[PDB]
Amino acid sequence: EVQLVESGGGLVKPGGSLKLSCTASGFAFSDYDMSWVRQTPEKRLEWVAFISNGGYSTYYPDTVKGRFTISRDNAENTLYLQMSSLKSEDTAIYYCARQGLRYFDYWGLGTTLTVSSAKTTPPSVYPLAPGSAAQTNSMVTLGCLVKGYFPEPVTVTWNSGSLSSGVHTFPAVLQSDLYTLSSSVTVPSSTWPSETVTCNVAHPASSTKVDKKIVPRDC
């Protein structure tokens, strides 16, 4: 079945270079025109590059012409996008697309590129507890402040994934060179501090894991 799987995304400094890959399976790859499409953070979709089935024709919009090179190795069922002189505006999720047709029909799931001078930094993780029995009745809200990491993403879970229903993890917000994110969980108050509640935070780019436990009084 038609499958497109991107790889190689990451963090790159302004002016730098990176090469994305897209692996195909489930069809005669060498029969098909192929494209790259990116989704900008403002949720715009942009045709990045096009390559004909045999690799002899190629198209780029002016935004990336002279900086981006699309190529393909038909023996290895792989499509490539070589980027250089990367700018801040190139930050996006890059999608592989198959183009048997003028319009797109089949897509991959994307690989992410962050173009930024900010350095990799693990997050600090702080517990959020009510305390003083200040506001406590039937349900209680607890949280988890994830501060000062770069780049995105982190993954937050609660009780190693056992508590999944009453959870809001909020989108990260960048505060010059560092992200902060928070996460709330609501549980019955008769179960806390009765049982334990702990948030778990993994930051892939720094390979850190931190489990913080929420302890009765934060006052």
Binding site: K43, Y126, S184
Partner: protein, 213 residues
Amino acid sequence: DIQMTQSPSSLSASLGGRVTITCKASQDINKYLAWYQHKPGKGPRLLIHYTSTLQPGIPSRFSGSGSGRDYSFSISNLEPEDVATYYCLQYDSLLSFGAGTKLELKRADAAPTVSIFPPSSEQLTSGGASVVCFLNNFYPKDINVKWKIDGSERQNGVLNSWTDQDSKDSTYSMSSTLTLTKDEYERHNSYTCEATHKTSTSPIVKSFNRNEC
């Protein structure tokens, strides 16, 4: 080269109602227009090509129409799973998308559940103090969060973050964080966040004092 202006950037609609998105080309595109549905965590889903041909497996609730420069796209009997962002795509000459339309559902008004949180010991030892305030499961999306330190309104040091529409109950949530240094955090007593929302005449006020524990 060829511009698509997609005409509502955002919209809310009731279940069972109809939604229409217009997409307008800079020049005639000869009915070469396709429509995409994009959900978080997936690639775009082709809905319609050639202005109005349903892709196979696409609900007949989705329709398109138009000619020349002006084009329409409609969802007829809205269901909860149509929440997404939608894009038109001309393919007459080269390819370009409309800027997109973010679709969310209407529900009965809900008031926010507000919770305030003092800085942790861990963070205070580090030299920092964040006060966090959650405004959870409210509707509609529009909400205001105000911070006061000893009764004086404070705008610096505040980071707001807001969710997309919750798939389970159609509510929204929002998080506000006021970050100070430790020395500045110790110069004041009361820390309050106020949630103003159309579900209540007076704002919901939650507050913390460094006044016991």
